[PDB]
Structure formats: structure tokens, C-alpha cells
């Protein structure tokens, strides 16, 4: 291996490891009853939501963890850590305190068109990203949509991937799963694809605007027979003042024919979404972002891995708020990835300076892509953007450097060894590459990386030219 072969990804920080709950977390309170527990990190004091699942029959959970570790989008849940005991599996998740969207529906009872569009565009953005990564949720409903915070513009987070699946473009899914009000009729017929999720969102949008479901009944039997027929109506007084554009989107998402049904990507682009979200937006720019991004060119892989962990797993909502809003703006199609053309079009928000019609901008975009694209997938992913654009004063705080070092130092002896370096990303392979990656930053010739050496390497990376 060479260093140019290594890839820093958010998923590499999650691996099946042996651990005890009491060793690293303190129990605060029971959040769900399978058990959701609010816990406090014994070192950083950060509170996290831990899903305790009791103990191949355990293959379903491992496949879910394999999906969960990949999830990197402003509108999708984040998995902080994963560990196991002799009896239980521990899914350490980022805690969201704004409640479920279900709670807001019960309290508000109905949403205006602008509010409904803002929420639904976020669900569609999350779903567009899932579908592009061959993931189908299969249980989208207001109970599985959490609000980030209790703050006014708090982001929607898609949660509960328990019924999720990796789908194939050539094969239809057969498992009848979901919730009575939200289930697509083709799921009931045991022959469906990812369009089943678009149906679920259509039902959610109908509820937001009207305050009642499109397929109702006193029993599940009544609801499902209405779902099977696929017949619903806007002929109710709750719909009198609702625009033609909102009804048009619902009709396309609740299109009985899966092939003719709007995709999550196309629904995000719908004229009603565009009009309503433009009303809400009617906006800050980044300073010295291009110079900061250029620092990552040819940078040490251990330094990339450290900063990626600090930015993606160690930063608060308050620290990333402005970055997430800029990312969402540049990400025109809301797929959670910034492609070459998106970077070109939204360049004025990155550089700060205004772009004229007259080449240089395309060269700078390819330089940014070469530096920030840590996994070499051709895009600047969400966590990659947060890493390369974050201000130094916030990203390089002592507590973040301490936690990043502690994560990589598996045995906790105060030194990152050759075995641990290969484990941060390649565990089985023995190579002079790991030894040489360390020797380049080793100041006391002991063949290990101590906290001081770790900090100096990161400081050299984010230092002025």
C-alpha cells in the first residue's frame, strides 16, 4: 500500500467492538421500550441515545449497522459508535431533542403550505440520498422523523432503519412491511421497489396540510382495504384553500402506478416545493474557504482521518449550523453530495467573491475536488464538506483533539501504535507503510504516535502558508 491508496470515510469509525455500557456511559433515563436509553459520555459529558438490542439470527442487525454507518446527510440520523456485550448490541446514536414530527402534528393539528413544504423537502432530500445509495426506508411516517432541536428552523432527521433494506435495480422486494396509513399498495401486493417510500411521503404531506390521513378507518382492516383500492379525495372543507400545486404534488406521490409515480428526486424539484421554499428563504457566505480547502491537498491520511472524525462525530449542531445551511444551498438537487457542476454554480458562496461569465473557476473546483474528496467517489460528501470548510478555532479545540486521539488509541496507553494505525481505517495486513506513516511524524523515535505528535501533525496541516 501507499498513502495515496487510503480512504478517510465516516463509516470507518464504526466497527464491531467489545465494550461495556457502564465503562463509557452513564444511564440518565429510559427514552423507549429493544430499549432506547438516554446516556451521558463519562469523559466528554455529551448525551447520546443508545438503542440496546438483545442477542445467524443477529445478521439482520449487522446489515442494519452496515447501512447506518454509511448514513451521512443533514436530514438523516447519525450513528456515533457501535459496541457489543455477551447479551446485547449497543447502537450509540446522535441525540435529537425536538421530538417526533408526530408530536408537532398533534400539537399544531395542520401546517400552512410554506411550513409543510419546508418539512417535506427535507424528508425528500434524505430519501433522495437513501435511494441513490440503494437504500429503501420502508417505514416513513411522522413518528420516524425527529426534530434536531426545539429551535424554530431545526432540521428534520430520518430515524429508525429497523425495516430498511438494500434494494437491487433488477429485483423487486417481497416483504410486506410498514404502517397501515403509510404503506404503498404494491407493498400489500408483495411486489415493489423504492417508489413505496414516495407513497409514504405523499401520505405524510396529505396529513400535514389536512390534519387527517387519506386512507382512514377504525381498524387496520378498514385502512388496508382503502389502501388496496388506492382511492382518496381532496373533496373535504380542509382542502378548500389549498393550492393546485400542493394537490398536484400529492397526486404524483400517491400515483397508484409505481412506474408513473414521482421519484423522491423529482418531487424535491416540483414547482410547489420551489415556490414555497423560495418564500421561506426570502443567507451567509464563507470567508477564506478555498485557501483552507487547498491545505488538504496531499495531506497525511492520519490527519485527514482525525479531522474527519472531529468534524463528523465530535461537532455540535451550533458549530455546524452555518456550514449545513451553505451545504444545503450548494446541493441544488439535495442528494447530500456536491458534484463538479454544483461546486461551479455555487462558487460565490464558497469563495465569497462574485463570479463573472469569463475557465479559472473550473480549475479551482478540480483542485477543491482533489483535496476534499477523501474517499475518491467524485463528490464532496456532507462530512467531507464540514471537515474542509469549518473554522480552525472551532474544529481545533483541545477537547476535539483529545477525543480524536482517544478513539484511535484503542488500548488507551497514550500512544497510537502500528496495529492501531491500520485499525483507524486494514487490520490483518502488516506493511512498512504503517511504520513509515508514523516515522514521518515521530519526534521521539519510539515507533508510536503520542498526543503531542498527533496535535503537531494536525497543526502543520491547518497552518498558514
Quote the DSSP letter at residue 363.
Answer: H
> From residue 133 to residue 172, what is the string marking binding to ligand ANP with x (rule CB under 6 A)?
----------xx-x------------xx------------
Q: Does 207 bind ligand ANP (CB under 6 A)?
A: no
Q: Does 31 bind ligand ANP (CB under 6 A)?
A: yes
Residue 95 contact partner, candidates Mg ion, ligand ANP, Ca ion, none, CB within 5 to 8 A by sort of partner: ligand ANP
Residue 115 contact partner, candidates Mg ion, ligand ANP, Ca ion, none, CB within 5 to 8 A by sort of partner: none
Query: CA 401, 404, 408: angle at the middle one, nearest 5?
Result: 135
162, 67 Cβ separation under 8 angstroms: no
> Of 5, 41, 72, 139, which is the active-site residue?
139
Among 24, 36, 188, 396, binds ligand ANP (CB under 6 A): 36
Report how many residues bind ligand ANP under the rule CB under 6 A: 14
Residue whose cell numbers read 491537498: 297
Q: Which three cell numbers, joined as nine digits, stand for 232?
A: 382518496
Q: Dihedral (C-alpha) 33, 36, 37, 42: value to the nearest 10 degrees?
A: 160
The dihedral through the CA atoms of 168, 174, 178, 183 has a sign that is: positive
The dihedral through the CA atoms of 4, 8, 14, 19 has a sign that is: positive
Is residue 366 annotated as a catalytic residue, yes or no?
A: no
Shortest distance (Å) from residue 412 CB to Ca ion: 7
The alpha carbon of 11 is separated from its chain's Cα centroid by a whole number of angstroms, namely: 11
Strand partners, 82: 91
User: How far is it, in rounded angstroms, from Cα 26 to Cα 324?
Assistant: 30
- Integer angstrom CA distances of residue 408 from 231, 413, 457: 56, 11, 15
Answer yes or no: is 445 a known binding residue: no
Q: Does 95 bind ligand ANP (CB under 6 A)?
A: yes
Element (H, E) at 27: strand 25-32
User: Which among 90-98, 245-253, 284-292, 454-462 is the span making contact with ligand ANP, rule CB under 6 A?
Assistant: 90-98
Q: Does 333 bind Ca ion (CB under 5 A)?
A: yes
Residue 32 contact partner, candidates Mg ion, Ca ion, ligand ANP, none, CB within 5 to 8 A by sort of partner: ligand ANP
Dump the DSSP string for 113-125. HHHHHHHHHHHHH
Annotated binding site: 55, 144, 160, 331, 333, 335, 337, 342, 373, 375, 377, 379, 381, 384, 409, 411, 413, 415, 420, 442, 444, 446, 448, 453
Annotated binding site for Mg(2+): 144, 160
Chain residues binding ligand ANP by CB under 6 A are 31-32, 36, 49, 77, 93, 95-96, 100, 143-144, 146, 159-160
Q: Which residues are the active-site residues? A: 139
Amino acid at each position: 500500500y501507499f498513502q495515496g491508496d487510503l480512504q478517510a470515510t465516516p463509516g470507518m469509525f464504526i466497527t464491531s467492538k467489545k465494550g461495556h455500557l457502564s465503562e463509557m456511559y452513564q444511564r440518565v433515563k429510559k427514552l423507549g421500550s429493544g430499549e432506547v436509553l438516554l446516556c451521558r459520555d463519562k469523559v466528554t459529558h455529551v448525551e447520546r441515545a443508545i438503542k440496546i438490542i438483545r442477542k445467524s439470527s443477529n445478521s439482520k442487525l449487522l446489515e442494519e449497522v452496515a447501512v447506518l454507518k454509511l448514513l451521512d446527510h443533514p436530514n438523516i440520523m447519525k450513528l456515533y459508535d457501535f459496541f457489543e456485550d455477551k447479551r446485547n448490541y449497543y447502537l450509540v446514536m446522535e441525540c435529537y431533542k425536538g421530538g417526533e414530527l408526530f408530536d408537532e402534528i398533534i400539537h399544531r393539528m395542520k401546517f400552512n403550505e410554506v411550513d409543510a413544504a419546508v418539512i417535506i423537502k427535507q424528508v425528500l432530500s434524505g430519501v433522495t440520498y437513501l435511494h441513490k445509495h440503494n437504500i429503501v426506508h420502508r417505514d416513513l411516517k411522522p413518528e420516524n422523523l425527529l426534530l434536531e432541536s426545539k429551535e424554530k428552523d431545526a432540521l428534520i432527521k430520518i430515524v429508525d432503519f429497523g425495516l430498511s433494506a438494500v434494494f437491487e435495480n433488477q429485483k423487486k422486494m417481497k416483504e410486506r412491511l410498514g404502517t397501515a396509513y403509510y404503506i404503498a399498495p404494491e407493498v400489500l401486493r408483495k411486489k415493489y421497489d423504492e417508489k413505496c417510500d414516495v407513497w409514504s411521503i405523499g401520505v405524510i404531506l396529505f396529513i400535514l396540510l389536512a390534519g387527517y390521513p387519506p386512507f382512514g378507518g377504525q381498524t387496520d382492516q378498514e385502512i388496508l382495504r382503502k389502501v388496496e383500492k388506492g382511492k382518496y379525495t381532496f373533496d373535504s372543507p380542509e382542502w378548500k384553500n389549498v393550492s393546485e400545486g400542493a394537490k398536484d404534488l400529492i397526486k404524483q406521490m400517491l400515483q397508484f402506478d409505481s412506474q408513473r409515480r414521482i421519484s423522491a428526486q423529482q418531487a424535491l424539484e416540483h414547482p410547489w416545493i420551489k415556490e414555497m421554499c423560495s418564500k421561506k428563504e426570502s443567507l451567509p457566505s464563507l470567508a477564506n474557504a478555498i485557501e483552507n480547502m487547498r491545505k488538504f491537498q496531499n495531506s497525511q491520511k492520519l490527519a485527514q482521518a482525525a479531522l474527519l472524525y472531529m468534524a463528523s462525530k465530535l461537532t455540535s449542531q451550533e458549530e455546524t449550523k452555518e456550514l449545513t445551511d451553505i451545504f444545503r444551498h450548494i446541493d441544488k438537487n439535495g442528494d447530500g453530495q456536491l458534484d463538479r457542476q454544483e461546486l461551479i454554480d455555487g462558487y460565490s458562496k464558497l469563495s465569497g467573491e462574485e463570479v463573472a461569465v469569463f475557465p479559472q473557476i473550473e480549475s479551482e473546483v478540480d483542485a477543491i475536488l482533489g483535496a476534499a474528496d477523501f474517499d475518491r467517489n467524485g463528490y464532496i460528501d456532507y462530512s467531507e464538506f464540514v471537515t474542509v470548510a469549518m473554522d480552525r478555532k472551532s474544529l481545533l479545540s483541545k477537547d476535539k483533539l483529545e477525543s480524536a486521539f482517544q478513539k484511535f488509541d484503542q488500548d488507551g496507553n497514550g500512544k497510537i501504535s502500528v496495529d492501531e494505525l491500520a485499525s483507524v481505517f486494514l487490520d490483518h495486513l502488516e506493511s512498512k507503510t504503517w511504520k513509515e506513516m508514523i516515522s514521518g511524524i515521530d519526534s521521539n523515535n519510539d515507533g508510536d504516535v503520542d498526543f503531542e505528535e498527533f496535535c503537531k501533525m494536525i497543526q502543520k496541516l491547518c497552518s498558514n502558508n
